[PDB]
Structure 1
Amino acid sequence: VYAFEPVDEHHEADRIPVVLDNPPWAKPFELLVSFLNTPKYGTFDPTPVVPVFFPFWFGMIVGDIGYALLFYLVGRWLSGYVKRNEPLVIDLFALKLKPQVIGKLVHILNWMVFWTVVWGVIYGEFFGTFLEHLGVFGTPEHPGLIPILIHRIDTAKTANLLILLSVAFGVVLVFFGLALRAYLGLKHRHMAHFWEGVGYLGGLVGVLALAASYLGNLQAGWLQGLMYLGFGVFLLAVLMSRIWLMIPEIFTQAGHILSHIRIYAVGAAGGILAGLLTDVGFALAERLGLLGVLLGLLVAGVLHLLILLLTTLGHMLQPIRLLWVEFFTKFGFYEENGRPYRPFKSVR
């Protein structure tokens, strides 16, 4: 009697196992999704937003097309190693990796490098500043080729728009996480977390409205009732909850929303570093002699590879860390850690 009985309901699912069940286009991010614990078997699977945003934020992080070409070369090396079907062995790292994880890493690197080359075309930056020699970006100071949407060197026309883009992306992610938490609370019929998410969304909206009214621009008439309704919704949800999730919690959520500008900060820092290194190398090569360009370009490539090996790990980690700190924690994702799907092995 193969009794295929149904699973439990939204309550009382504790010893029930957990599985990914994601699309095959998003199957490669499973290791990064399962680096943390498991959901509550009725919690929102956030693995799709990882491939939706971590590539989009990571392309905004690193906008060097020469680094994208070096990543393509390293991915071709890893692809040849995986095609050789040998285990990835690193003795000083003590890292033994199967071919499936290496292939998922290669697929994630390709999906990252596509949008990375797209944003590097948007930033107009190839291996630092190769446009100092041949002006592939078109600037009004020196028109060499077609115009760049972002010159990525000066910030007088770029910093406000970049901060606005980062703030809009972070606010959209925070609103999506609060909406997912409220929807999961409505699904689980636990009105405490639902009222908490609704009040957090209303308080964040009122805080952003009052900030843009007072510390922002003029015309404080349209958003005045908006800020009043946001503060009133915050107080009404505080009365409906009485859980003392105070203004400290609202300020922590507001800081988690406002922390998205670190992506633009790290992108501008890496761009300034690569542009300064490439400009110093091109100056000391061409303008100083125009014949030590071989040795000068070799030292410049060595310094660029050293700076890449020094900073690219943190530059790639900061977006995934911000995603794990925002999209998980705004939607909870820290309750009971789930139960793992451990079937019969037949290890073979």
Structure 2
Amino acid sequence: NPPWVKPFELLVSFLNTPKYGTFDPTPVVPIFFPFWFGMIVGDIGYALLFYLVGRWLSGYVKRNEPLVIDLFALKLKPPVLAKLVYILNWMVFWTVVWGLIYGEFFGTFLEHLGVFGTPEHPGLIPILIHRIDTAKTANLLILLSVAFGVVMVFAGLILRAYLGLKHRHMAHFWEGVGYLGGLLGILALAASYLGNLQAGWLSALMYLGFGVFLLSVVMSSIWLMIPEIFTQAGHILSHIRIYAVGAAGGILAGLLTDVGFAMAERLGLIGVLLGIVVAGVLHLLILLLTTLGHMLQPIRLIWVEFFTKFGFYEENGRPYRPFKSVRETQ
């Protein structure tokens, strides 16, 4: 299938080349994909209009100045460079298309009379009411993202340990195994906050035997950065805080469209349909600019793990090239 096989084909040159006992950076691309696709989840005013933006890059229009015949690789970028990122352009298209579907996902909780009391067809324009303005409905989608972050923490920490296993370097080995002790304690404390009255007495007692696992083989490794374990927990907190912003900020972009493409004038009567566009034109571009900032959250997510050592080459230089230059063509 084009979505996985096409970028997967370029990862084949790096399959062939290993430089450590950690497994080659092939899993990275499907870890990237959910969060990347999931960055567009807006409504009528954002996600469902995004269609136009995808078609420019993977297709060819005249609308933008340096883009003429993309088929001859004409871009801002050099003609060759544009040919190199055809693969990416296709994946940008899949990203925009998965963004349109998560617009219809979005209108499951913002339209139909089978899911909420909101009209199945409004008398003005679809997405006249927002019901993702209720704290709890919005929260559950946040907590869904947070979980994917716990998984990525596990994925990295197995990879951290594997490096010393097949490279035969004990220091890294000891660090990857000991840190997973910390994970039992992350999951305990979390259960008590995610379900609320789930633990709190079954993770105050058990927490204590979970903390000893955390440092037990870390002390064989020695480690004369004892405080630095605050920052290792922090790294966990950074994957949570980034998936969270990707969720919350996702819904938030759409809730600004509440006074943008629906209703913000009169009494909310039928005439707002042809009055709202007054505001629409202004918000649109402002919104566009800030959601480009939201698509940088993926590569910021990779950099916590990639560039701060959790099974990967990067951390203070080192052989192999940054994941940014790798995904750039893929």
For Structure 1 versus Structure 2, the TM-score category normalised by the shorter chain is: 0.5 to 0.7
Q: Is the 8 A contact 2:306 2:314 kept in 1?
A: no
Question: What does residue 177 of structure 2 align with?
Answer: 198
Q: CA–CA distance in 1 between the matches of 2:94 and 2:74?
A: 28
Q: Would you say the 8 A contact 2:23–2:159 is kept in 1?
A: yes
> What CA deviation, in whole Å up to 9, does each residue of 1:125-155 have, x standing for no partner?
6999996899997659999999999976234
For residues 207 and 178 of structure 1, do their structure 2 counterparts lie closer, same or farther at Cα, with a shift above 3 Å needed? same
The root-mean-square deviation of aligned C-alpha atoms, in Å, is: 7.1
Which of 174, 187, 191 matches 1:208? 187
**Which of 207, 214, 220 is the equivalent residue of 1:235?**
214
Q: Deviations over 1:149-169 (max 9, x none)?
A: 997623432354234322211
Aligned length: 327
The alpha-carbon distance between structure 1 residues 278 and 195, as it changes in their structure 2 partners (threshold 3 A), is: same
Instruction: Please say if 1:280 is aligned against 2:259.
Output: yes
**Contact 1:182-1:198 at 8 Å conserved across structures:** yes
- Quick one: distance in 2 between partners of 1:52 and 1:224? 30
- Name stretches of at least 5 consecutive residues in structure 1 with no aligned partner: 1-21
Instruction: Report the more deviating stretch, 337-346 or 206-215.
Output: 337-346
Specify whether residues 82 and 334 from structure 1 end up closer, same or farther in structure 2 by C-alpha distance, changes over 3 A only.
farther
Q: Distance in 1 between matches of 2:325 and 2:314?
A: 32
| Greater CA drift, 70-79 or 25-34 | 25-34
Residues 1:180 and 1:221: Cα distance change in structure 2 (over 3 Å): same
- Between 1:288-297 and 1:89-98, the stretch displaced more is 89-98
**Residue 45 and residue 261 in structure 1: after superposition, are their counterparts in 2 closer, same or farther (change >3 A)?**
same
In 1, Cα distance between equivalents of 2:67 and 2:49 = 20
Q: CA deviation at 1:182?
A: 0.9
Structure 1 equivalent of residue 18 of structure 2:
39
Map 1:144-159 onto structure 2 (within 5 A).
153-159=132-138
| Structure 1 residue 52: Cα displacement | 3.2
SS of equivalent residue, structure 1 residue 86: coil
Per-residue CA deviations over 1:98-145 (Å, capped at 9, x if unaligned) read: 688776897667776787678767765699999689999765999999
Q: How far apart are the structure 2 equivalents of 1:345 and 1:278?
A: 32
- Rounded Cα–Cα distance in structure 2 between residues aligned with 1:255 and 1:54: 24
DSSP 3-state at the match of 2:75: strand
Greater C-alpha Rg: 1
Distance apart, 1:227 and its partner CA: 3.6
8 Å contact kept, 1:206–1:228:
yes
Shift of 1:313: 1.4
Quick check: 1:206–1:226 contact (8 Å CA) kept in 2? no
1:233/1:93 Cα in 2 relative to 1: closer, same or farther (>3 Å)?
farther
Cα deviation, residue 197, structure 1: 0.6
Tell me, which stretches of 5 or more residues in structure 2 are unaligned? none
Q: CA deviation at 1:254?
A: 1.9
Change over 3 Å in CA distance of 1:252–1:84 after alignment to 2 = same
Q: In structure 1, which of residues 148, 162, 184 is the aligned counterpart of residue 163 of structure 2?
A: 184
Counterpart CA distance in 1 for 2:62 and 2:195 is: 56
* SS of aligned partner of 2:135: coil
SS in 1 for 2:89: helix
Q: How does 1:121-160 map to 2 (within 5 A)?
A: 153-160=132-139
Task: Look up the match of 1:65.
Answer: 44
Measured in 1, the distance between the counterparts of 2:64 and 2:21 equals 38
Describe the shift of the 1:281–1:248 C-alpha distance in structure 2 as closer, same or farther (beyond 3 A).
same
What is the TM-score of this pair, normalised by structure 2? 0.65
Structure 1 residues 192 and 51: CA distance shift in structure 2, 3 A: same
SS at match of 1:96: coil
Contact 1:137 1:145 in 2 (8 A): no
**What is the SS of the residue equivalent to 1:284?**
coil
For residue 342 of structure 1, the aligned residue among 311, 321, 325 is 321
Alpha-carbon displacement from aligned partner over 1:225-273 (angstroms, at most 9, x marks no partner): 9945853653653464343265533322222222234345434554555
CA–CA separation in structure 1 for the residues paired with 2:324 and 2:139: 56
Contact between 2:54 and 2:93, CA under 8 Å: does it hold in 1? no
Residues 148 and 127 (structure 1), Cα distance of their counterparts in 2 relative to 1, 3 Å cut: closer
Distance in 1 between the 2:217 and 2:172 partners? 12
What is the DSSP-based 3-state SS (H/G/I as helix, E as strand, rest coil) of the residue aligned with 2:261? helix
Is the Cα contact below 8 Å between 1:170 and 1:260 reproduced in 2? yes
Q: Distance in 2 between matches of 1:122 and 1:148?
A: 15
CA contact (8 A) 2:41 2:99 kept: yes
Residue 326 of structure 1 deviates from its aligned partner by 2.7
- In structure 2, distance between residues paired with 1:303 and 1:69: 18
Rounded Cα–Cα distance in structure 2 between residues aligned with 1:218 and 1:44: 40
- How far did residue 317 of structure 1 move? 0.4
Give distance in 2, aligned partners of 1:345 and 1:116. Answer: 17
Moved more, 287-296 or 171-180: 287-296
Instruction: Give how far 1:321 is off.
Output: 1.0
